[PDB]
Design a protein around this ligand. Structure first.
Ligand code: 6M5
Ligand code: MG
Ligand code: ZN
Length: 337
C-alpha cells in the first residue's frame, strides 16, 4: 500500500524512497519529501526516522498507533502558515535525528532520550498561528490569557502534543512503564520550552559551560554523567535543529528565508490593520532580508553553532563551513551606498 513502507499513501513510492536515501544526512531535501508524500512530510519523516532507529520495536508501538498519532499531529500544523507548518517540524525532527548520530554523541543517550528529543522536535511548533508570542500578548489573545504571557506558544505546543495522545488509537506511549513516561514527559517539556528565543542566551551560556568542562571517554565520546548535563545537551540540540536553516545548502536556506519573511510580513499586515506599531522585521515596505539574515547569523546562529561545534569538535566542521559560506552569500547581496 506504501502506507506500510512509508507511512503515507503516495503514488511516487519510487521518488520518495530516493529522497529518503538521505534520511541520515544534513543534505536531505524535505521540500522534495513533501512533494512526494502528498504534502505529509512530518508523518513521513517521523516514520522513516522511527524505522531507521528501531523505536517502534523498542517501545512496542504499533504502526497503526504511530501513523494515527502522526497524521493527527500533522493536521494540527496550519498549512496556511508560511513557515511554522509541518514542513518546518519535519525539518527539525530530521535535523535532530542527524544531530543525535554525531559521532562524539552517538553512544551517549538512551533510547528513551532519543525518543524524547525526536518527539519534541515533531511537536515543538504544533498549532502555531503564524504570529509571535509578543503579538499574542499585545492582542489580548485567548492563548496569552490561558498562559499568563509566559512562553505562550511553546506551552500551547506541548499541551496540544500531549493532548493528542488521548485520541482514538493515538497513544504511542501506552507500552512504556509509568516511570519511562514520567521521564520522557519531563524531558519533552524541557526541550520544547527551550525553543523559546527568550531563553536562547541562557541555553547558550549553559552550552558554553558544557564546553569549558567537557570530558571525553578514551574513544572520543562525550561523557555526560547526570541528567542535568544530558538534558542540557539535548535541549541545545533541539534548539540548534530549530536554528539550522542557515547551515543547510544555499538552495534550501533561501526557501526557508522566503517563508520566514512571508510569515513576518503576514504578521505586520495584521499589525497595520489593527493600527499597532509594526514589529521589527515585519514591515514588507522597509525590511532588508539580506542584512537581516546576516544579523541573525552574526548574533544568534553562528555563536550557537560555533559553541556546538566546540562541544563536538570536529564533528560539526562542515556545518560551520556551510554557515560561513551562506553568511557570505547573503552579505554579498546587501544593497550598497
Ligand atoms: C530563515 O531565517 C529565520 C529563521 C527563523 C527565525 C526566527 N526568529 N525568531 C526571532 C525573531 C525576533 C527577532 C530576531 C530574533 C529571533 C524567532 O523567535 C523564531 C521562532 C523560533 C526560533 C527562531 C525563529 C528568523 C529567521 O530569519 C529572520 C531574520 C532574523 C533577524 O535576526 C536578527 C537577530 C539579531 C540581530 C541583532 N542585531 N544587533 N543585535 N542583534 C539582528 C537580526
Ligand atoms: Mg516555536
Ligand atoms: Zn520551530
Amino acid at each position: 500500500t506504501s502506507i506500510s513502507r512509508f507511512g503515507v499513501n503516495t503514488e511516487n513510492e519510487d521518488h520518495l524512497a530516493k529522497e529518503l536515501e538521505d534520511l541520515n544526512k544534513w543534505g536531505l531535501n524535505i521540500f522534495n519529501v513533501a512533494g512526494y508524500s502528498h504534502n505529509r512530510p512530518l508523518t513521513c519523516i517521523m516514520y522513516a526516522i522511527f524505522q531507521e532507529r528501531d523505536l517502534l520495536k523498542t517501545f512496542r508501538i504499533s504502526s497503526d498507533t504511530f501513523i494515527t498519532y502522526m497524521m493527527t499531529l500533522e493536521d494540527h500544523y496550519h498549512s496556511d502558515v508560511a513557515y511554522h507548518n509541518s514542513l518546518h517540524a519535519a525539518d527539525v525532527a530530521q535535523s535532530t535525528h542527524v544531530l543525535l548520530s554525531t559521532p562524539a554523541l552517538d553512544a551517549v543517550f538512551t533510547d528513551l532520550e532519543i525518543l524524547a528529543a525526536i518527539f519534541a522536535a515533531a511537536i515543538h511548533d504544533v498549532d502555531h498561528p503564524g504570529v509571535s508570542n509578543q503579538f499574542l500578548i499585545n492582542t489580548n489573545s485567548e492563548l496569552a490569557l490561558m498562559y499568563n504571557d509566559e512562553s505562550v506558544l511553546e506551552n500551547h505546543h506541548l499541551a496540544v502534543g500531549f493532548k493528542l495522545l488521548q485520541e482514538e488509537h493515538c497513544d504511542i506511549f501506552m507500552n512504556l512503564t509509568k516511570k519511562q513516561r514520567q521521564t520522557l514527559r519531563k524531558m519533552v517539556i524541557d526541550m520544547v520550552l527551550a525553543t523559546d528565543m527568550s531563553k536562547h542566551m541562557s541555553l547558550l551560556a549553559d552550552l558554553k559551560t558544557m564546553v569549558e568542562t567537557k570530558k571525553v571517554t578514551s574513544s572520543g565520546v562525550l561523557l555526560l554523567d547526570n541528567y542535568t548535563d544530558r538534558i542540557q545537551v539535548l535541549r541545545n540540540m533541539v534548539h540548534c535543529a530549530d536554528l539550522s536553516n542557515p547551515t543547510k545548502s544555499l538552495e534550501l536556506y533561501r526557501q526557508w528565508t522566503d517563508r520566514i519573511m512571508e510569515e513576518f510580513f503576514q504578521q505586520g499586515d495584521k499589525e497595520r490593520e489593527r493600527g499597532m506599531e509594526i514589529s521589527p522585521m515585519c514591515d514588507k515596505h522597509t525590511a532588508s532580508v539580506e542584512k537581516s539574515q546576516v544579523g541573525f547569523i552574526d548574533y544568534i546562529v553562528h555563536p550557537l553553532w560555533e559553541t556546538w561545534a566546540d562541544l563536538v569538535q570536529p564533528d560539526a566542521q562542515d556545518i560551520l563551513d556551510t554557515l560561513e559560506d551562506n553568511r557570505n552569500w547573503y552579505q554579498s547581496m546587501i544593497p550598497q551606498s
